[PDB]
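User: Show me an example of a complex going from sequences to structure tokens.

Assistant: Sure. Here are the input components:
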Amino acid sequence: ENSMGGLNFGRSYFDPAYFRLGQEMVRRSAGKVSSTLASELGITAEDA
Amino acid sequence: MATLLRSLALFKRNKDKPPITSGSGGAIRGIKHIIIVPIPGDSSITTRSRLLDRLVRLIGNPDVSGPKLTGALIGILSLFVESPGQLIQRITDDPDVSIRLLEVVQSDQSQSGLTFAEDEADQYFSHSRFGWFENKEISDIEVQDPEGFNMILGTILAQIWVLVAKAVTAPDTAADSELRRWIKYTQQRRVVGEFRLERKWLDVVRNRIAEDLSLRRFMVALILDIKRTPGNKPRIAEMICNIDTYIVEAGLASFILTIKFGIETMYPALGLHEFDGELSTLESLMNLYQQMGETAPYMVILENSIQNKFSAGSYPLLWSYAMGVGVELENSMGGLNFGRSYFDPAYFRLGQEMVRRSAGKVSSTLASELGITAEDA
Amino acid sequence: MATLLRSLALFKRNKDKPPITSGSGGAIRGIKHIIIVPIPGDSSITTRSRLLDRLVRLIGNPDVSGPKLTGALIGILSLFVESPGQLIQRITDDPDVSIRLLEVVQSDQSQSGLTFAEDEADQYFSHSRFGWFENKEISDIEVQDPEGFNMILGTILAQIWVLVAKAVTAPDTAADSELRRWIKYTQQRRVVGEFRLERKWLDVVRNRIAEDLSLRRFMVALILDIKRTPGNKPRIAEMICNIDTYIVEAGLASFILTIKFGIETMYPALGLHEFDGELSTLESLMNLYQQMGETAPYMVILENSIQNKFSAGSYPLLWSYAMGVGVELENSMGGLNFGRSYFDPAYFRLGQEMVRRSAGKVSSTLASELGITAEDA
Amino acid sequence: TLESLMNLYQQMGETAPYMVILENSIQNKFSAGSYPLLWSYAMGVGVELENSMGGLNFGRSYFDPAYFRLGQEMVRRSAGKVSSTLASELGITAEDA
RNA sequence: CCCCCC
RNA sequence: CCCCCC
RNA sequence: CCCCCC
RNA sequence: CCCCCC
RNA sequence: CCCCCC
């Protein structure tokens, strides 16, 4: 969600080590995986 | 056995539902208005025929008050029942407003209108800029044989219910599809293609509909009663329901369409980690629509459920994709100008990218009766 | 286990169905007209024989009112029963209209018509531009032995039921297939190839049918009763049902054809992401047609269900393909001129492209009794 | 409490129908003030049953519209389906209308 | 809303 | 909050 | 303890 | 306190 | 001790 500017963050237990880990997952994936979904999905064909 | 998912499924209780209990007495509106609603006398094609002229004049006239216009709008609407007085009391179902009954008697003298038993018609009917129908000549409000009264009465009502569709959605004063409705119900003889009212008369009515809340409550409640009427409904009632078939969720664009374009189509790029969260919460919201029913299409007009529940603010990611992917599907995507704070153009173009890259090729698997290959176009 | 699809299947409840409950009393038509329907006396080939002349004259004559023409059209139709008076009251099933009974007695004096017990025939029958049959000579309305009365009576009725097919569909005044019906029922001796009425007489009748709503209700209800009559039905009743076999959904072109050309054919380019959404919602709509039955073919004439449900507006994508793909199949695709706001010509040409590119080759798989290769033509 | 009131009507008899005209028993006993909840439901549920519910304009201080609509809601939601159990001569299923 | 063929 | 097509 | 969007 | 239908 | 509705 784009709405992550107002909340300035910043706590004593912010834990920046695992904070960047979460952001790293969404940028490395960029699709490819599709939450398995073994019902109605299909195979391959996910360029974007 | 998936304790996380089982508990997560229970978390959706936050949405449904506020409790329904006998908590009356405390929270009440009070302060009841009067609203003088003129009601005709016996069942005939007299009095009410010339009363039609007095109400349509009163509505289309400057220097008028709220209740005077409101009561006239109610009276002009309810004019096809044997006992409108009994009908209103039964159908009103509104605590805030108590409707009074004013009986109209035969025009025996008529100084400058009617007497409706005490000639109290000093400035109610007896109040050129008004205006009138397209023809600057029509008069006498049709005093003839009983045949024809049903058409001339239905002509006015037919236009009123159309304005309901375009009232709470948007003003749309610059350009509206009102003429598109008038050319309809003409190719087929449902109403006589005549007695067209000017836009000025429609303007003052459309404004008041959007203004007053209770006025819309009476109109909505009227539809639910005539729709559930079994057997061969009246001829007029068919025309009323015909127009009411366009109100079907006139406002929930981000709900009825996001399912048709997003979920019903099932594209490969649908079940992702991004849309996984919005997909689950959308199903719990969809249940809210059906579990109530009856007044489910009529939500945006009166009901407060459209504030946060049906809004796309809860699911801006899935909504942006469903709207973007369903652009090339249907040509009708020009009027809706779009543009919200959470438009999310990143995933919007992604949906449009899928339909243009595919161009057939895939055929939704369909492991039953499809075949193999041979899809050039 | 596919929670999305299971819930999505439940979402189709939005279509079916408004509730059927005892909500009478409130929503009522009221204002009952009279409609004087002439009914003959005893069962014989007298009085009613010469009454036939008075009704056919009254119908085909300028300067006439609504009820006078309506009642005559009802009377001229119902003239093959032992007790029409009892038949009408039982079969009418219409709250808005109450049918009165006027008994016709033997013509003992006849000043200028009939007396029908008080000779109240000043300007009902006793009202050259009218007109008459093709032969400018016929007279005496056939006063002969009882044999022949069945044919001359059935001749008029046979033409009336034909006009029902072409009334609510379109005016079609420029060119209609009326002569195509008259040449039929002649090659085979069902009715005597004579007593042909001019188009002017048919014009004033066809206009009134499309105009009045209740007049069509009586005709439709008449068919449902005579069709369900078990055993050897009357000779005339066979002729009535014969014409009624053409009304089969005379209007639902985007429903009965879209299945035959689109679904029943099963082409490779059918189950796509584009048509996936429209295919699912179409099945729920198809159930609506069958679940009611009885009056299911008769929908466009009176029922309001054809406004949004059966219309192609809900599924413009699938409809455009089914119509386009079924052009080369049947030659009869010239009269229907097409042309709607949601025509969708992009997918229209796609359907036509499939049938011309294939030219055989594929054989719908058919893994039972087909064979391999050898399909040059 | 309604059953005890019903007994009052029958135990006297003779002049029981003629109560509102002269007798003072209609002040508090037969009035709906004692049972406004049950009365509001019984009146609301019996609207769709009989068409003759137009003349009586209703409107009392203890109208109780919360339970009034509840009665009307029952008759419209059911639309048949249930058949008062009737464990004697009824049958199973086959109630479309 | 409806435009055919049977 | 709402912007279409039917 | 709390910082948004709806 | 009472507002119908029979 | 008592605060309503009928």
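The lines above are the inputs; the final block is the predicted structure for all nine components together. Helices of chain A lie at 16-29.
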